[model samples]
Structures are given as structure tokens and as C-alpha cells.
Target: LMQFTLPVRLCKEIELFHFDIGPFENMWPGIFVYMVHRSCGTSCFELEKLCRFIMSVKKNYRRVPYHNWKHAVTVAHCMYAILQNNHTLFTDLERKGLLIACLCHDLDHRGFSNSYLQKFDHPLAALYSTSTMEQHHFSQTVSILQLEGHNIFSTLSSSEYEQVLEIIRKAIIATDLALYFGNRKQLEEMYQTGSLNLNNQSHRDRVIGLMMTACDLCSVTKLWPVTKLTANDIYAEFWAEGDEMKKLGIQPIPMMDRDKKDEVPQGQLGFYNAVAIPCYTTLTQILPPTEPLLKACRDNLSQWEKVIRG
Candidate 1:
């Protein structure tokens, strides 16, 4: 429905593995197209169809403050980097699934939380009583893939296609913070007890879930400048929802209210400790190469702590 037909700017090797791609937002569509062909290869996906599919995916994202196309591409690129370092850890099919799932994880977000959807009696809330937004995101992803000239997985065998779809669905739904909270304890225990087997389907599925959580929250592990900028974008979206709730005669939480902006640093500290840190720590335990992500997150956490002290 939308067109971003700009010429492709070949990315530097540094750009592919780093978060500095923000300055190249105009080139993200092409850069992402390049990444797909490089990672998944053109054997199963035609270049023309792949480009169309990526453009369509970008078009599907709403102009939300945070969970927009930028967020999607960032998460996908983060996964791309992780896979480059640990490709043997997952099957080729599984790697492709993670890339597609990350890119489409938050498709069609409306700048509101699942909580806000329920509070306003939004129809999506009625459609999905649990993990409402995640379900909607997965549905949107399937819809786009089904679109004419947009099915990148068209060449896969029927069984392979089904498996890929299942992986994508599970990975997309795992992006939900609620589900992350629910699953983390089990994930922690499995790893701690030395029972996390990559060969086992169930164990691998949980590990993939943790990988999704790590990528989805990867912004917290970016450089200080990038982290600060992304954090504000998140709060901007939250505050917008807060403004809406006020008109509906409902109260918004401090994390969402613009009037409570001063509390954001404290919120980040709590979020990083309660949510981000444990997810990354456990993931690093599983994949030692991902230690850089955990280290960067700890650095950002300290930066936030410094902000609070100031």
C-alpha cells in the first residue's frame, strides 16, 4: 500500500552487527532486503518477491512512536547479528523463522498497550482475551505473507512451510512481556538444572522464546546515546496512551503518565533489574557469544542509575 522505492545503500560490515543503523533509517528497507538474501539465501526466496514482501511488511506498521518499522528492523537486525555468531545452534529453517518473526513481531501496533486495549473495550481485546496484541501481530504477519507476490516462503515444501509458520507464530507470541514473565522462571530452572537440550523440541522452543525476548528488548543493550533515544520513544508512546486514558476518565500508571516523566529513570532501573537483566543473563549462559549483549545492558543500567542519582 506504501512505496519506499529508494535505491539500496550497501551497508558497511560494521553497520550489520551494530545498532548505529539508526542514522540510515532511509536505507533500512533495502538494508533489510540485503540481510534476508544474505542470511537465508536466494535459493528458496526470489529477490523480487523478497523485496516486495519486506516493503509490504514495513507498510503494515503503523506510525507509532516506538513499535514502528524502526523497532521491527532493529529487532530483526539484532537477531541477524546473533544468528551470524551462532547459526549452528539453530537449524537453517529455524534461523529463517527467527528473522521473519522478529521483523513482524509488533506488526500493526496502535501505539497502545494490551492493557489499554482492554481498558477501552477495544474489539481486539474481545478478539483475544490473552496475549491480545501478540496474537493480532501474528495474524497480521500471516495476512501479509498470504498477499499476492509477498509469500517469501512459497518455495518451501508443505511440511517445511508448516513448521516455519509454527516457529514464527511461537516466536512472535513470545515477544509479549507477560508471556516472558511467565516463561522466564521455567527457562531459568531448565538452564540451571542442566536440562536445556538443543536436540529436544520443547527445550529448543523455550530457548527460542528466550532469544526472542533478548532481541525484543535489545534496545536496552545499545550504546548510551541509542539507549536514551529509544527509551524516550517508548515513553512517548506510553504517554500518548496515558493522554488518551485521561479523556476516558481513567487513571494512567506513573510509567505511562507524562506528568510522571521524572519517574522514567527509576522505572528503567526497575525494568532492567526485574526484566531485562535476567533475560539477558540467562540467554548469555546458553550462548556465551551473546555475553556482549549482557555486558552492554549492564553498562546501560549503570547509566540509568547515574541519571537517577543526578
Candidate 2:
């Protein structure tokens, strides 16, 4: 709940990290404020309303191990760094939507996935009928924007407002990992054929969707301490969900079984190669301006392998 008055600038442009937006543990009100001010393109945008939006967005998240406000801020921070590093590639509308999407991507997360929602017959599952949690997160984002002082888009032209929401929904829904499988393949073929064009709206949207996914798992591309700790939070979350499922007479996946915690190193190894690698590879392919992102992914995967060798 701290306002985070201290500035959280990036480190000197060293080659070790991907723009080095570290301090993942204690960084963000003003940090985010400054980020959005630039991402939003500094016109007709209300700074006061921006502050209210940030505060209320944080309030909406629960006190869970990983899918809480801290994770939201971290995701947002990562996106901000990514966008800022290549600010010219994104339109003001795209930057605005992408940054806001990251901030609210996990709003009201129950520390569980869509499977848990459907198993327990959670209302959101029935209401959404697909990507339940992701849908709820998007809806929650819209509701917050309607709040009296939190209407950050109030000054935007009506058409611009609609476009922003369009972008926001695309960015938020893209967080559903299941949804991105097709995106990953499409991007891969695009990469293979060498026709990935950010200028085209179709290609850009897919790349943006993929970028959202990239940032969600971005901890994988970070240094070992941050990467390892992030995976641990997910482990605890999945293990906790399994306990809830067991009490409800449902079975959890083997990956969620707490007894097999040792499988983490191996699972992460496969995850990096299969999931993480393809994502950033596609990103760097489309957004040629962001080759550093690919470097970070490769570096982090190597770090994981080295730890396995330990």
C-alpha cells in the first residue's frame, strides 16, 4: 500500500540483463506514473486520473502468493521497459493499451486457473464459457475505468476511447496461455516466411498478443534469483490449488502435486525450451527492434541449465 515515492530508474545500459528493470521485490506508483505518462503520449491524458487508476487497480488484487498486486506491478514494469525500449515501434494507442493491460492483467485472480473455476462451478466459468479467468480480469479492468475519478480515458476522443479498449481487450485476452498456442505457431510461420510486418494491423495484433505472453512469463528471462523465486511462487500456488481440488473430490495434475516438488528444475527446463524459447523467438522475429529480448531468454535458459548441472 506504500505509494513508492522513490524513483525506479533502469540501470546503466549493461549487456548482462534485458534493460535491467530489476528491484522486482520493492519497486511503483510514481515509477508506473512516469512510465504511463510517456506511453500514453502526454496529451489530453489526465495525470490525476492516472494516479487514481493505479491505486484502485492495486486494491482489486488479492493477497495471494504470486498472482497478487506485486506480480501485476512486476508484469507492468516489464512491459513498460519493453515498450520504452522500443517506444517508436508502438503507436500511442498501442502503448497505452499494452501498458494498462499489463497493470490489470490478473485483477482478482483466485490463485487458480480456469480448470479450477469450472471444476468448482465458479460463476465466472459459466459466465465466460471460455478463458473464464481471463475474461473476468478484462471485465474487472473495464469496471475500474468506470469508477468516478479513475476514468483515465475520459479525455480521450470517443473513437480513441473505443480503440484503446479494443487494444486493451486484445492484450488482456492474449494472456491466456492456451490462446497463444495458435499465436505462437502463426508467428513462427511468419518468421519462417519472413513476412512479419508490424506495419500491418493483422501482424501487429498477433505480435502484441505474443508480447503480452512474453511479458507474462518474462521472469524466465530475468536473472537466476528472480527467475527461481518466481517459479517457486507458481509452485506454491499450483500446490495449493491441488489441495483445494482434492477437498472437492477432484484430482490435480501431476505438475501440481507438492510431493513431486523436485520435478521443478526439470519442468522449468522443458518449459523454457518448449514455451519460453518460441515466444521470444517470435517476438524478436516480428519486433526486430527488440532483439535484446531474445538474448535475455537465451541467457536465462542457459542459467537454468547451469543450475540443473549443479
Candidate 3:
């Protein structure tokens, strides 16, 4: 039970690889339907209800400075780009799972990170302990799926459903920054030795994790305007958390501290060198077609460095 609908013509108009479809609330639903239908077979699920479910998922996202529904939409769009770029790289099931995971990865992000939650003894921190909010994001996804008329996966076979959830769990939790750094290093090592074979499922899962991380931060891969826009959004979220921690009589880290906002450019430069370059460089090496990701990253670095200089 929900209400939403889109003409097939309009939905089909939203191309899988097109992230800059300008702007529209219609953009999100259109993109979601496009990927879901493209990956899972257009006839696999109820279209109208699927649109409703997407709306519900969007609604569940909080008004955090970042990690909001717009973030989810962009991540989902990036996943669409990956699938379209690689074409035959992954199975249809894998494609659908990855898309779903990206769309729900930051669900209910609360504007506070795992470190913030843990330090504050947040209830979710105690419940997950390890992945913390990552686990909560997945739990929220499952909860939405269970809502009446929101079972978009209902058409799948029991085994297929389980397989999808398995992928979703791994993909969403993999967005955890700590896990991302770990996965990136392993992938980087494999890339260094030229042994990362996507034909292997184990290797493929790691790549999927990498893909999710890349999508989660796809802003760096966008043009300068989009990159700066997303940059501000993330730092705003961090500073908000910093403010919250201060209210609790705790000192926030330098990254989260608004008092150090002017240092953001330096921080961005460092992230690009340490995280962006290493991660996307290795990825482009593995899949030459992903060169744009690296190129845009370098583009963003110059802007970051320019800010640092100024």
C-alpha cells in the first residue's frame, strides 16, 4: 500500500548510464524502475507497487546533511552505470542485488557515524557492535520489504530471494568506511600482481564490494560542480555530528570538527591521494572502461588542491 505510477515510456526514457538527467523527483523513480526492470526482467515484479516501495525507501531516509535519499539515488545511478558499462560482467541476479544494495545502503543514517554512535553508547551500536549502522541500514531495508505491498522481491523464488538478500547484506555493510579500506587494500594488492580474475565468484564479490564503495562516493567521479556539491554535503554532516558530540561534552575528531572547516580542502586532497587514487586507479587498471572514474577523480583533486592552496 502506497500510491505511485510512471508511464513505461517515461521509465524507459531514463537510461541506465545517464546520471545527469537534470533533476526531477521523477528522476529517482524512473531510474529505480529502469534498473530493476533491466536486471530482473520487466515482468518479474509488480511495477506500480515496486514504485511505491521505492517511494517508501526514499521516505525512510532521514534529512541528514548527507546520506539522505538523494545520496541513495546517486549511488543507485552509479550502480546502473557500472552494470551498463561492464555489460556482460555479472549475472542478472547479481546486477539486481547490487542495484538494490546501493539504493538502500545509507538508509536511516542518523547523521552520526559508527565512531560517534559507539562513543555515545547508542543503542544501535550495542546491537551491531561490529558493522553498527551498516547492520541497521540492512535491517531497515528488510523492514521496508516486509511492509504490506512493499515486498518487491515477492516474485523471486525462495532461493533467489535468499541469494538477493545475501548480496544486499554484503554490499550494504561493505559501504562501511573501515571495511572499504580493507577491501580496497586487498583489491589493490591483487591488482598489483594482476591476479584479480572476475571470473571467480570470490573475486567477483570483492569487486562488487569495490563497486559499491565506488558508487557510494561516486561524487568524486562526477564533474567539478557535482563533486563540490557532494563534498559540502558530507562535511556538513560530519560537522553536525561534531556539534552533537560537543553538546555531549566530547571532543569530535578533526575530520568532524566544524572549527576546522577551512582545512576541508587539505583533508579532501589527502582523501584523494590515499583513498580515491589508490581505489580508482586499481579499478581502472582492472577494467579499462572505468577510466572516466579515475579521470574525474583527478579533476576533483585539482579543485581540492586549489582550495588547499587558497
Candidate 4:
């Protein structure tokens, strides 16, 4: 029931941990930790440590604008909430793996879309030529975990460790927008067949994957103040990328250049309406508690529409 707001104290703590952010100057990291712990229990400690580490990485190397610690924390919170509400549908191990994956999925991402990274031959893609961004993220996360004392999953048995890794990989890969249509089709087919098997690996993974991706894409479903702060963070990231592109003599994406673009906000609003809202609505139809959250997204989208239209 805690309302969303700028994570001032959280941002500062992240900075202390060497993760700097200009916008969330007063956000509190303790609150984020508390929320994650409340949702996922003791295991979240491991995830939090990974979050701190990811935040400590230099800015230019980040993958996406909204893919920072705050965003990670937010998605963790959302994943926790979803699993808590849907506990009956998941096994204990599956839930734990899902939560861990949600927290560490986008660690150390450079502020560019996956397509941009792939197109420009970014080092990540080059190093992981056969792998998707999700695979690269998982690889980086595993490498970070191998740093002696930093190994977050040290307590897991060998079998549990493998299972956890598999779950994390699937869940993270599900975030790729390129796979969105395929995933939706699979989910719809499951729904149509009345075989929404909560225990099947593929089915369960797809469900959790969709849920996490939805959480990431639908931040506008949150409260106004929270939405504003998140929006600003996203814009800052876009602008930073624009600056990078400018230095390289490349044209910036429309949203990345505020001055040249009048329709950026409108375009985002359209995406919310045409993409995010519909997706979440469809998700809610299959999982009813999601309805309220989806409605929140609709309301947020409406607010954005008004602002853009005016």
C-alpha cells in the first residue's frame, strides 16, 4: 500500500555503494530493500547485493535508461507482489528463482535498446554473438556472482543452483520485445486450450515472464508522483544516449532529443495506450487481480494523453 515517490534516500545509498543517479537524489535504498524482503523473504538479500553491485558500474556502460537500480528495485517489487498474490500457482523454488531473476536481470546495461546494441555491434552482442541481450545479462550476472565473496547463490545446492539459473534465464529472456508476439501467442494458445498448467516449466515460465515484462513496461500504472519520477529518469537516460549519439555524429532518437521533437511524449502516450494498456488488460483477463493494476495503468495512460494532447 506504500505509494510511489522519488527514491531520494535510496538514490543516495546507491551512490554510496558507487551507483550514482542525478534524478532520484533523495530516494531511500532501505525502503527498496524492505519492500523486496517483505515480498521475497531472506533470499532477497542476495538480490539486493547484486542490485548494489550493478548500480556501482559506470553510467555509460548501462544498457537502458530505465534499467538502473531504481528500475531494478521497482521491478523486483512488482515481481514480488505478483508472486505473493499468485503463490498458489508457483512452486517455492520457482518463486525464488523468479524473484532473483527479476532483480538481477538488467544489471549493468548500457543505455541503448537491444536493437541498437545488436545493430551497432556493441561489445556485449559481439561477446555474446549467439546469445540475446537476456543471455548476455545472465552471463554478466553469473560472472559477477563468481567474484569470490560476491557469489549470491553460494548457499544453493548444485541442483538447486542449476534450476535457479534455468529459471532466471527463461524469465529474463521473456523481456525481449522481439519475443513479445510469440509469447503472447503461446499464452493465448494455452488459454484457449484450457491448459494453463501452473506447474509445467514452459507454461509457468511464460506466465512469470509475461508478468515481469508487464511490470517493467507498465510503470505508468503507478501513482502520479511515482510515474513522474520514473518518467524523468527515463528521459534523462534517453537524453544521455542522445548525447552519446551526437558525439558519434549519429542522429538521436526522437525521444532522446527534446528540442527537435514535439511528439515524443505523445508517442509514448500512444505506446502506452496501444501497446502497454492492451497487453496488461489481456493479462488481467487471465489473472483477475491484475485488473486493478491494469486499470491504474489505464488511468495513468489517460493522464499522459491529456498532458501530451494539451
Q: All candidates: CA RMSD in angstroms?
A: 3.4, 3.3, 3.4, 6.3
**lDDT measured at residue 159 in model 3 versus the true structure, 0 to 100:** 98
Off by over 4 Å in 1: 1-17
In the range 186-292, model 1's lDDT, one tens digit per residue, is 87788889887889998888888989999899889888988998888899899999999998899998998999888899999999999999998988888888888
By summed lDDT, which 10 consecutive residues of candidate 1 come out lowest? 1-10
Q: Is candidate 2 or candidate 4 better by TM-score?
A: 2
Of the candidates shown, which would achieve the greatest TM-score relative to the real structure? 1
What would the per-residue lDDT of candidate 4 be over residues 19-131, giving only the tens digit for each residue? 22335523434445554455556553465454555344223135455776666656766676666566576666676667667667776676666656666668777776543
Model 3, runs deviating above 4 Å: 1-18, 21-23
Residue 105 lDDT, candidate 2, scale 0-100: 95
Better of 1 and 4 by lDDT: 1
What lDDT score is found at residue 209 in candidate 4?
70
- lDDT per model vs. reference: 0.85, 0.80, 0.81, 0.65
lDDT score for candidate 3 against the true structure: 0.81
For residues 153-189, write the lDDT of model 2, one tens digit per residue.
8868999999999999989999999999899999899
Top candidate when judged by lDDT against the true structure: 1
TM-score winner between candidates 1 and 2: 1
* Alpha-carbon runs more than 4 Å astray in model 4: 1-29, 32-37, 40-65, 129-132, 242-253
TM-score per candidate, in order?
Answer: 0.94, 0.90, 0.91, 0.78
**Candidates 3 and 4: which is better by TM-score?**
3
